[PDB]
Amino acid sequence: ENLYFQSMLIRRLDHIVMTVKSIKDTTMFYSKILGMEVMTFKEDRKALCFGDQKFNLHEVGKEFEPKAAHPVPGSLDICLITEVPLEEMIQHLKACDVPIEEGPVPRTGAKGPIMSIYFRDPDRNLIEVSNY
Amino acid sequence: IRRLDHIVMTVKSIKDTTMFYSKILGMEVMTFKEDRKALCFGDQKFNLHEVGKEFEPKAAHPVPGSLDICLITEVPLEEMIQHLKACDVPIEEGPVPRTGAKGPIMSIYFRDPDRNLIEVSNY
């Protein structure tokens, strides 16, 4: 009954907690490479904002509770949609000397087929940047 | 303009994970590329892979239980709590006031089968 109700109620990701070796290195990378906004909250916390979502950052050895059972840097494999044409994103990554691991390639998005490029962040998380 | 589309979740058992997310959060179990499985919950999804089965490109460390995520629902948190209690899913924390990307949120926390931390919230 409640299973059925939840099946028809839309849900959305608000944020994810990313565990990193260095918050300084990660904030520098996401601000320069993807234009994410570096924000400070609760006086001692950092986040990367984009659109209506964010990444909360935890630094290895400085994690806040509660957290993932296994906070591991480099365990994330995420796909970000951008309205920026993928060709312009490729030009941007080449300019910033960020190697493109794969792409442009066709992939499956949540809402249908997407075009994607892949690259690594400082912790070797896999970042997929895509267009619908 | 940038938005999260999907995340890859590494799991011990696709059967256990799909049953949990379908029952507890009403996620749709979908099959794509003949054998691949995903959990669809709105405009986003979780792609699933069993431990050691995913091919490159993948995360440097595909680890079960490494996720710590927050999902917004329009379902009142009190109704969510009653659903988890009925399904015998322990609520680790909540309802508590927390910080969302767009402002304050009300949250509950619980573990999935791989002990990922799942925060379910309301704006």
Side-chain angles (χ1 to χ4, degrees), chain A residues 3 6-9 11-132, chain B residues 3-33 35-73 75-123:
Chain A
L3 289 80
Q6 273 152 266
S7 173
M8 305 279 170
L9 256 139
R11 169 176 312 275
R12 60 190 204 270
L13 276 162
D14 185 80
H15 58 267
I16 68 164
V17 173
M18 185 189 280
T19 301
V20 300
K21 171 180 146 77
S22 169
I23 282 174
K24 184 181 160 78
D25 288 350
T26 295
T27 57
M28 289 177 81
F29 178 89
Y30 282 96
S31 180
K32 290 160 201 285
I33 304 310
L34 293 176
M36 297 195 178
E37 177 186 4
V38 180
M39 204 116 90
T40 304
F41 69 104
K42 289 230 285 170
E43 272 188 334
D44 302 309
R45 306 281 313 270
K46 292 277 178 68
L48 288 157
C49 304
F50 57 92
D52 301 324
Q53 293 161 317
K54 62 167 176 161
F55 300 154
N56 282 334
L57 303 178
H58 287 193
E59 187 160 304
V60 172
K62 305 176 176 70
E63 306 93 339
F64 299 97
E65 294 294 328
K67 66 193 190 304
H70 304 113
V72 169
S75 61
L76 285 170
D77 179 348
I78 59 121
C79 170
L80 296 157
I81 305 303
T82 182
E83 290 300 317
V84 179
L86 214 54
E87 184 39 50
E88 290 174 20
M89 286 307 290
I90 289 161
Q91 290 298 97
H92 180 65
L93 292 161
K94 287 187 181 187
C96 298
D97 286 275
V98 170
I100 302 314
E101 195 160 306
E102 191 153 358
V105 284
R107 290 296 185 263
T108 301
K111 304 307 268 189
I114 59 180
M115 303 186 306
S116 295
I117 61 171
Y118 293 87
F119 56 89
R120 302 281 164 177
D121 78 358
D123 293 280
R124 304 217 91 216
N125 292 310
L126 180 67
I127 313 308
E128 183 181 358
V129 171
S130 308
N131 288 168
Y132 273 104
Chain B
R3 60 191 205 268
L4 275 158
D5 187 80
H6 58 267
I7 295 161
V8 173
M9 185 189 279
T10 302
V11 300
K12 162 107 253 72
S13 168
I14 281 172
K15 184 183 161 81
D16 288 349
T17 295
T18 58
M19 293 291 171
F20 178 91
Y21 281 97
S22 58
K23 179 172 164 199
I24 304 310
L25 293 177
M27 297 196 177
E28 178 186 3
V29 179
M30 283 245 272
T31 305
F32 68 104
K33 289 232 284 173
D35 62 324
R36 305 271 313 277
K37 291 278 179 291
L39 290 160
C40 305
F41 48 89
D43 281 5
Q44 284 118 13
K45 62 166 177 161
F46 302 152
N47 284 331
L48 306 179
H49 292 286
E50 279 190 348
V51 168
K53 295 239 192 169
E54 192 183 6
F55 298 99
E56 289 285 352
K58 62 188 164 66
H61 300 286
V63 168
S66 61
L67 287 170
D68 179 345
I69 63 137
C70 170
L71 299 158
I72 305 303
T73 182
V75 179
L77 215 55
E78 185 39 51
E79 297 183 25
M80 290 308 299
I81 290 160
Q82 293 300 98
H83 183 60
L84 273 55
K85 285 186 182 188
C87 297
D88 207 31
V89 170
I91 299 180
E92 195 163 305
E93 190 155 356
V96 284
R98 292 291 181 268
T99 300
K102 300 207 279 290
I105 60 179
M106 306 185 293
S107 295
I108 60 172
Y109 295 83
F110 55 91
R111 303 282 165 177
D112 77 357
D114 293 282
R115 309 278 305 161
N116 291 310
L117 180 65
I118 312 308
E119 182 180 0
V120 173
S121 307
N122 291 163
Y123 272 106

